[PDB]
Each structure stands twice: as structure tokens, then as C-alpha cells.
Design a protein around this ligand. Structure first.
Ligand SMILES: Cc1nc2ccccc2c(=O)[nH]1
Ligand SMILES: O=C(O)CNC(=O)C(=O)O
Ligand code: NI
Ligand SMILES: [Zn+2]
Length: 331
């Protein structure tokens, strides 16, 4: 078996290899990349997402989210407090202000130490889940707005035609902005391109060990666990690498820099934080290997994790037995 220790693999495709997206994902998996839950892809030196990022300041962040923490440094939840709209230019200025800017640090490891020591004592503001794309329409390779759709994948694999669409989301981050432990909707893949700015550090649990993380989460957030059989779907729980190690949870870490892609694989739990002002673009996608994960994906039915229009059809077709109870949480 390839990659038995479930290490995060890093790929350097040639421009020729960068033409066929599906084929390269399949290649990565043939090398065992999916066992880690996360892979890095460094694009060919000839490739660019777009010409410049000089004219992005007038993008609107309609609902910036202030991420307020509760708990202890290594085991906490965050809730999102809605703030007034601001442009990306205004957001960048805020990110760089004395209150929010990245502190002096020696290296990525030093900054990681500072993050887990001090994150809960601050409330950074995130521009998340903004529908849109920063890929030039003339960028033909690995353009996250031009991928084959999950709906068409389901149709190709299973022969059923369904409603729904599948578009990218932009994320504007600052120091300490945080993404909680989660797998994707319906345990889909995700692909994430860091367009511009400071790095993003990722943590990931191998898919074959996802249930170990779930068990620890139930122990660490016992009230949440009683309230919902899949509360990590709420995307609000954080557990530090120190606490993961103390509890023997297998995981890996890696830092993504501007110009690099990350792919998360089905049922690969991940979490992380931004180093400073940045912009990422991400979208879910599927492959034939995803279908069995989609069938088995655990759902939030307590209702906290609202399920999108498009995910309705996934549950309806792949999980017909759960559909009724699960749609009540939606309604
Ligand atoms: C990144 C990582 N380091 C470890 C060190 C000791 C024991 C376990 C781990 C682990 O799961 N991940
Ligand atoms: O970048 C973020 O804040 C969150 N991204 C993801 O969880 C992802 O790409 O799957
Ligand atoms: Ni994700
Ligand atoms: Zn729930």
C-alpha cells in the first residue's frame, strides 16, 4: 500500500501534467496521497491564476465574521459575530492595524506556538464564504471556477440527473483567523488555492482515523455531543496539536503559501489558521471514489448546520433513508 504512514504529500506537476485535472487527482491517489487527508500541489512555474492582484480592493465582504472564542487555549469553540460590511481594501487595512496584525516571530513554528498560546484572547475578523472567483477566465488549467461539477459527476457515475450548482468561495483572512475541525459537506473533496498574502497552516487527520477524532471531540465537548450526533458539522470546535498528541490522535500539519494548492480528501478532518492578511479560493469537488464516502457521510439533523440547496439532492439520492429526518433540520 502506498503512503502507509499517511504523510502529507507534495506534488510538482509539469505544465503538461497540469492539463487534465481529474487525471492528476487520480495520479496523486495512485501514490497514496489521499491517505493523509490532505495534499499540497505546487503549480508549474509557467502557470498563473491571474495577471495581478492590484485591483481587488473593491470586492465587498458583505458580512465579515468576528471569531469569538470560549474555552481553554487548546480546547475551545468559536462563534461568529456578524459585523458591518467592508471592502477588501478596508479589510486589508484592518488586518494590518496594530490591533490585528501578525506579531514579530522567528519562523512558522514560532508563530504556531504563539497562535495556540494566545488565540483565545483575541477575536480576529474573517471574510469567509464569499461567492466568487479570482481566476482569470483565460486561465485554462486548475481554474477553480471551471471544474467539472459534483452534479455531473454523480450523473456520470450513477446515471441520475439532479438539480444544483457548484461554485467557488473566496476567503479573506487575517492573523489568527481560524477554521474549525471539519470534513466537507457530504465528505466531498475540497481544493483550496492561496491567491495572495500570508500563509495558512493546516492540520489534518487521516480519513482512516477520522472516527478517533470524533470520539475525542465527543469527550472534549460533551454538551455539544449530546445536542447533535454530528456536531463537528457545526464547524466551531478547535483542538490543539498538543491535545491531539496527548490523546494519541494521528494527525499531520503543513503550511500553505501563496501560489499553492491544497486538496482535502473525502472524510479528511482538517483545521487551521491564517498567518496574516491573505486571500484564498476554494470549492468542493468529487471523483468516482467519493461516491461511497457520500453514501456514508454523517449529517447534522439538530439543525444548526444548515444544508445548502445543492446538498439537498446529494442526501436525497445517496442517503434516502436519512433524507426525511435531515430535511426537517433544514426546515
Ligand atoms: C505531526 C505529529 N507529530 C507527532 C509526534 C508524536 C506523536 C504523534 C504525532 C502526530 O500524530 N503528528
Ligand atoms: O481556508 C479556510 O478558511 C477553510 N478552507 C477549507 O476548509 C477548505 O478549503 O476545505
Ligand atoms: Ni474544508
Ligand atoms: Zn447539529
Amino acid at each position: 500500500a502506498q503512503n502507509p504512514n499517511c504523510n502529507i504529500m507534495i506534488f510538482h506537476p509539469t505544465k503538461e501534467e497540469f492539463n487534465d485535472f481529474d487525471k492528476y487527482i487520480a495520479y496523486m491517489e495512485s501514490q497514496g496521497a489521499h491517505r493523509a487527508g490532505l495534499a499540497k500541489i505546487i503549480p508549474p512555474k509557467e502557470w498563473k491564476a491571474r495577471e495581478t492582484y492590484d485591483n481587488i480592493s473593491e470586492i465587498l465582504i458583505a458580512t465579515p465574521l468576528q471569531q469569538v472564542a470560549s474555552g481553554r487555549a487548546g480546547v475551545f469553540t468559536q462563534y461568529h459575530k456578524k459585523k458591518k460590511a467592508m471592502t477588501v481594501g478596508e479589510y486589508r487595512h484592518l488586518a494590518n492595524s496594530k490591533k490585528y496584525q501578525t506579531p514579530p516571530h522567528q519562523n512558522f513554528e514560532d508563530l504556531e506556538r504563539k497562535y495556540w498560546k494566545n488565540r483565545i484572547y483575541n477575536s480576529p475578523i474573517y471574510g469567509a464564504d464569499i461567492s466568487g472567483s479570482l481566476f482569470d477566465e483565460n486561465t485554462k488549467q486548475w481554474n477553480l471556477g471551471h471544474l467539472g461539477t459534483i452534479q455531473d459527476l454523480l450523473e456520470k457515475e450513477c446515471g441520475v440527473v439532479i438539480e444544483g450548482v457548484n461554485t467557488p468561495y473566496l476567503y479573506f483572512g487575517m492573523w489568527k483567523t481560524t477554521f474549525a475541525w471539519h470534513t466537507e459537506d457530504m465528505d466531498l473533496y475540497s481544493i483550496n488555492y492561496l491567491h495572495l498574502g500570508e500563509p495558512k497552516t493546516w492540520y489534518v487527520v487521516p480519513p482512516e482515523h477520522g472516527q478517533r477524532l470524533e470520539r475525542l471531540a465527543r469527550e472534549l465537548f460533551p454538551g455539544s455531543s449530546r445536542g447533535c450526533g454530528a456536531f463537528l458539522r457545526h464547524k466551531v470546535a478547535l483542538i490543539s496539536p498538543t491535545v491531539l498528541k496527548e490523546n494519541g490522535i494521528p494527525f499531520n500539519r503543513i503550511t500553505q503559501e501563496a501560489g499553492e494548492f491544497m486538496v482535502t480528501f473525502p472524510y479528511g478532518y482538517h483545521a487551521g489558521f491564517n498567518h496574516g492578511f491573505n486571500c484564498a479560493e476554494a470549492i468542493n469537488f468529487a471523483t468516482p471514489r467519493w461516491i461511497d464516502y457520500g453514501k456514508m457521510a454523517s449529517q447534522c439533523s439538530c439543525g444548526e448546520a444548515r444544508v445548502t440547496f445543492s446538498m439537498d439532492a446529494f442526501v436525497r439520492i445517496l442517503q434516502p433513508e436519512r433524507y426525511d429526518l435531515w430535511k426537517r433540520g433544514q426546515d
